[PDB]
Amino acid sequence: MKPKFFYIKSELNGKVLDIEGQNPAPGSKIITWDQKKGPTAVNQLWYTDQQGVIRSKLNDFAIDASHEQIETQPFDPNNPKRAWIVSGNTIAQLSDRDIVLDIIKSDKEAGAHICAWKQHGGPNQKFIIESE
């Protein structure tokens, strides 16, 4: 039961998305940051579940768009926000294929928060994936 992880880094800023917490600690906010090299990179690596739900390599944890800002927490069957699917070069919500995470402010500034927005083809909505 050893799936595959990947690297999710914005195609605009070239930074890698990371979860503020690097642990099972639920409620951690997500943002963009510089890619790291070592045993502390899992925070920027994710994997896809058998059901099509991504979860950070750190452990069985999916992001949820319940609040204004995207956060990570334990998967919830009754929560249609804790199930994110990957579409090409973008992360899209399960119940909303027309919704996909994006970089707030569309700026290059690192450590910037993110949220799910209506796909508009904007450069700020472009991300790159790198399997391990």
From TrEMBL:
Q: Does the keyword Protein transport apply?
A: no
Q: Molecular function terms in GO for this entry?
A: carbohydrate binding
Which positions fall inside the Ricin B lectin domain?
A: 3-130
What keywords is this UniProt entry annotated with? Lectin
Residues involved in N-acetyl-D-galactosamine binding: 18, 21, 36, 43, 102, 105, 120, 124
Recorded protein name is: 29-kDa galactose-binding lectin
Taxonomic classification: Eukaryota, Metazoa, Spiralia, Lophotrochozoa, Annelida
**Part of the full-length chain shown:** 130 to 260 of 260
